[PDB]
């Protein structure tokens, strides 16, 4: 099997944990402690290749350290999650990219932009505004819903495919 180290990043309340737990454990979490940052591991088949996914679901506080930089630099690809009904989470996306670029010491880091909670009727972030941002970064954009499982596998699998292209 081939190993991939994926990091789920994004503002509080956007669905980082709900997404991760859906991918790993195939069920939806109505609320999850926002201070709990855990790594998870799962074996899956992606485009015929048996893959070992290590997933870091980031949490806690906005705090920085040499060690946390090492935890994050371990990531090979990053899921950048915002919520479609939370305009601020989308504005924050630039901050997450710049931090990833900083610890990875590269302008070219595998990433996917995720718009979560797409099961909700009230949006404040238009699909198109998110699509343009991703195109300008040169990365995929996937809409997901951790509640309905829609797009969930596609979001993480597309990130694996992006890490593959990085070689």
């Amino acid at each position, epitope marked *: 099997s081939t190993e991939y180290k994926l990091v789920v990043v994004g503002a509080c309340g956007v669905g980082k944990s709900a997404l991760t737990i859906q991918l*790993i454990q195939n069920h939806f979490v109505d609320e999850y*402690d926002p*201070t709990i940052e*855990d*790594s*998870y591991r799962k074996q899956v088949v992606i485009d015929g290749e048996t893959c070992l996914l290590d997933i870091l679901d980031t949490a806690g506080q906005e705090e920085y*350290s*040499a060690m*946390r930089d090492q*935890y994050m630099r371990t990531g090979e690809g990053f899921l950048c999650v915002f919520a479609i009904n939370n305009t601020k989470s989308f504005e924050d996306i630039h901050h997450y990219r710049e931090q990833i670029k900083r610890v990875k010491d590269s302008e070219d880091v595998p990433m996917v932009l995720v718009g979560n909670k797409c099961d909700l009727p009230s949006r404040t972030v238009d699909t198109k505004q998110a699509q343009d941002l991703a195109r300008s970064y040169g990365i995929p954009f996937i809409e997901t819903s951790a509640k309905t499982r829609q797009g969930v596998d596609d979001a993480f699998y597309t990130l694996v495919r992006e890490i593959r292209k990085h070689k």
Partner: antibody
């Protein structure tokens, strides 16, 4: 950060079995880490007992492997220790711990519980 | 204990002290060494991982090395708070288990 807390009887009388539970909070038992029990006789050194992964796999210390069962309860976010055929020599502070991260290795005992003294005496 | 450490060490505030840890090819010789510091009355806490790396909060006056089947913890600029029991640990291939040194009581002379 994850926190661990041991609990269980402080006194065990042989024929009886040493039984302890580790309540995990601030982190899921289903994370990609190994969960260990370690013990320390008063004024002596540390001795690793065993480890368990959330899937159920275990490694045990060969010196205790016949007497040791470590189990995982994902519904209570807990793991537990059963040490049978105990004697007064098993008197020790028992610690539970989390380590061997699949994400970033820091070693076997990244986080420790407070420890609980179990006295063994018939 | 499967690994071997001197039972005690000591030094004056400000000086350098080393603590040795000897094992065999099945443990230290094949595997990373981790060091734990146990302050009096507390649980052990990670001090050095993978021979020579420091986790958060551990100042650079603590340093580790590993050579062959032996490893070494060095503490410079010795301070009163460093008085504690130090343990080395490693995976042992023969036993398929984690093993410890016996512990070294470091006394910071007062």
């Amino acid at each position: 950060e994850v926190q661990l807390q041991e609990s269980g009887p402080g006194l065990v009388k042989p024929p009886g079995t040493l039984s302890l539970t580790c309540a995990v909070s601030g982190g899921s038992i289903s994370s990609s880490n190994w969960w260990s029990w370690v013990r320390q006789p008063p004024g002596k050194g540390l001795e690793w007992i065993g480890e368990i992964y959330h899937s159920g796999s275990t490694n045990y210390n060969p010196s205790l492997k016949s007497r040791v069962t470590i189990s995982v309860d994902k519904s209570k976010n807990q793991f537990s220790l059963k040490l049978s055929s105990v004697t007064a020599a098993d008197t020790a502070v028992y610690y539970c711990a989390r380590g061997s991260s699949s994400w970033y290795d820091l070693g076997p005992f990244d986080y420790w519980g407070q420890g609980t003294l179990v006295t063994v005496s018939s | 204990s499967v690994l071997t450490q001197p039972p005690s060490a000591s030094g004056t505030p400000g000086q350098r002290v080393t603590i040795s840890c000897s094992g065999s090819s099945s443990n230290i010789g094949s595997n990373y060494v981790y060091w734990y510091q146990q302050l009096p009355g507390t649980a052990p806490k990670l001090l050095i991982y993978r021979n020579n790396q420091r986790p958060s909060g551990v100042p650079d006056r603590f340093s580790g090395s590993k050579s062959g089947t032996s490893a070494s913890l060095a503490i410079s600029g010795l301070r009163s708070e460093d008085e504690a029991d130090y343990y080395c640990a490693a995976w042992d291939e023969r036993l398929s288990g984690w093993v410890f040194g016996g512990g070294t009581k470091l006394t910071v002379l007062g």
